[model samples]
Target: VRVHILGSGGREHAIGWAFAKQGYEVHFYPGNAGTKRDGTNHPYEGEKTLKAIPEEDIVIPGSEEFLVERSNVFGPVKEVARLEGSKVYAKRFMKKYGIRTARFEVAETPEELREKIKKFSPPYVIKADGLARGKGVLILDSKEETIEKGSKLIIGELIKGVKGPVVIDEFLAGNELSAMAVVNGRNFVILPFVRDYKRLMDGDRGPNTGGMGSWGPVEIPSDTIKKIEELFDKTLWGVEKEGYAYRGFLYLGLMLHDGDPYILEYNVRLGDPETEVIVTLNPEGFVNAVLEGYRGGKMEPVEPRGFAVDVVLAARGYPDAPEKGKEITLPEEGLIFFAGVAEKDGKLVTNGGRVLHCMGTGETKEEARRKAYELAEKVHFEGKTYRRDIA
Candidate 1:
């Protein structure tokens, strides 16, 4: 069957790649430059970043009200997606269902911010109550800095450089894991877990961009399997109790601490880079899974076909002031999924930060890592910046 995927990034490009290889007609709108592989998929040229996105696809590149329009699909459901549309609503839902999460207080006004923020100690964690891409959260070291940053989130622009109501939570310490599921109303097909490295520079230091890199089919311990199962069940329990259903993809950004799991946030759609690896594994089943979920039927759980690693290439000054329109070069091999790339005057050029997701695979993690990094080293672009530590 022909498929039309939305979005114009590495994630979408990867998904399109999977479909195209299966002999299915694939279409992209505002799609990136790397999607023309295999001579099976179709990508249109226009104003940078996915310009004339596949018209049949459910998106328009320059539509200002797109997010709001998408939210309408979930506001009524409430239980399954309200958390993603509004962080404050998410906290309330968690409390109502007794889900594990950070203790948070909402600051709807500037005065409320001061009083509610005092409860958390230094090195505060402040989050905007609405969507700001992946940049809604701020971790401030000093109370003074927390107050200043919190003020911006509550009264000024801080996320995507835009401001609004914010949530202040106690700093929870632990490693993070990302999981995605295709939902059929309340039932879902859970995907393999992935871990994403966020810092722009390695050693875990530097401002966060959309993401620096990622790896999939994370090797979980034989011991921790039970704990993982418990979190997944808890999520389902809450969804069932709320009498709401979820369609499409749901991303659980989970924090594992004290041998248990806690949710950090929710994404109503599949996340980038991670999606880069997932589509590789679910090449055939993903389309079926999504179709089943849309019709309110459960899909079989997605199992890994192989280990995959993704390393993101970004423009210098990324996550701040990205240098755009620079020339790029690459090798003959490797699954190069494009993000901020455009065909400029018949030449491909860097059109945004976090340019491409360099993907590699193998029967083993080490082999996958080796191939992924090897490709990353060869791929070139001006002002190019990528974390050397990505596995």
Candidate 2:
């Protein structure tokens, strides 16, 4: 069967690559430079993309905002998309369904925020209720700083006419990880657990970015894995109970504290660098698994392979003000997936925050990490940035 992939990023590139590897006819709408190698690339416009989609074929929403009406479009509609669009909505949903998450309180005004923030001590988290491209969170060291900065952030949003509540959450100290699955209603299949590097700089310092790097098929204890699966099952149950039809990838941002898992957030699409790595495990089978789930059939669990690592190559001043239009040169030895890249006079050039993803596969995590970094160096661009300690 043929597939139409939406969005222009490393995740979309990986998806197209996987489908193409399985001998399926793949097409990408506004896909990046690397995607064209695996499938057909369309102009980066939503209207044109919608017009070009087949009436009855697999349509995967990668990073686009528009949702197609048919079930063939493997994604949730606007009603169920709230799980990722609004933090307040997700928090309320978790509370309503007994899903475990960090303690949080929503505040609309500065005074309300100040009062709500006082309930949590130092080093708590304050998040913008709406999406902020993975940079909307603030982990303050003290209540005073939180109030001062939180009020400023809240007031700034209000001044800018951005209408979203501020959420004050009790900070949970632990390791951050992610769990992804392909879902169709209550039937779902879990992908390997991935540990993502969110901070832009090394040693976990600097502002949060879309993602810097990731390694997967991580060796979580069997018990923890079981618990994570239970969480996904509960989430799917909630999705079905709420009268919504979801048929696509679902991601859970998780924190492992004291060997217990806690929900950090929900993303209704595939994770970028994570996809670059996990899709390496039986790429053909991954495509078949999603198709099976979408067909309302039971999906057998997707088992883990050895290991894979994916490192992001970002442009200068990423997650803030990225310098675009710089020329890029890639080496021929590694698997490179393009993101914020475009063709300029037949030469590839940077066009967004993240430029490319370099992935490496191996029998162990260290081997994968080493190969990933080695490949990451071969790709050259002006002002290229990446984290050294990724795995």
Candidate 3:
């Protein structure tokens, strides 16, 4: 079988790697340099590129923006993609379905934002209602600062910021987890849970990047697992109830507080480093599982026997101004998925914020973390930065 993946990031590479491992002919549109090892890279022009693909070939949306209506595509339609594209819609869906999440209120104007913000306490979490490439979230410490920053976000002052409404959420502190699943509206296959580090620096300090590193297949308490399962059940049910048949990757950004799980947000597609470790673990079975779900058939996805860790290498000044175009040297290791890389004068170089992912799998978590760090050390790039406390 032939599969075409959309987007150009480590998530796309990881998805293609899994398909390639399953003997499928994989292709990526505007894929990074690292993705070339697993598939062919092609030029992309948004919807035009997606419409050109043959119907028989499998089409997987690697990012949320590309999830559209296409018979060959294996993802949710545009309306469903709004689950991630619009924060207000996701919050409404959660509220409608009784899914546990942080309480939030939407404000359309700066005045409205200032007025609505008063209902909440200090240290407010304000997020742009529309997509801002993960940079629209602001955790303000004071009401005055919250309104100031929130006003700027509403007015499009922040770079790559939002110009519409903002969703104010109560700050929920806890250990975060990524719960992902491949679903077909009726049934679903849950993948191993992962912990994604978002802060650009170590010890959870500094500004938030797309993702710094991750580790997965971690053990959770049984009761908490039940809560997560219930959340998935309600989420799928809610999607179906909204008159949409969803079939694609679903990411639940969770905050485990006081032994309970609270959904922070949703990603319509697979996560970056999360996908890197996950697809590597169940490489051969992922394609089959996606197809099975697409056909509305219940299939138990492959279970990984071991643990995996993902360490991300970022360019200098990530999450704001990433210094790109530096040469990169990778080790002869397995599962070194690329993200923001390009071919410069036949040399692999950084092209975006996140450069590459060094993923290592082992029978135990410690071994996996160790191997991941080892791989990270072998890779060389100018202004290379990574968190040392990953996983």
lDDT string for model 3 (189-240, tens) is 8887777898999899998888899887877888988898898899989988
What order do candidates take by lDDT, descending?
A: 3, 2, 1
- Return the TM-score for candidate 3, rounded to 2 decimals: 0.94
The best candidate in terms of TM-score: 3
Per-residue alpha-carbon lDDT of model 1 for 21-54, expressed as tens digits? 7776766654777776622334444333244333
Better of 2 and 3 by TM-score: 3
Worst 10 residues of 3 by lDDT: 57-66
- Show model 2 residue runs off by greater than 4 Å: 55-69, 158-162
Q: TM per model?
A: 0.86, 0.93, 0.94
Alpha-carbon runs more than 4 Å astray in model 1: 38-80, 157-161, 221-243
Which predicted model would earn the best lDDT?
3
TM-score of 2: 0.93
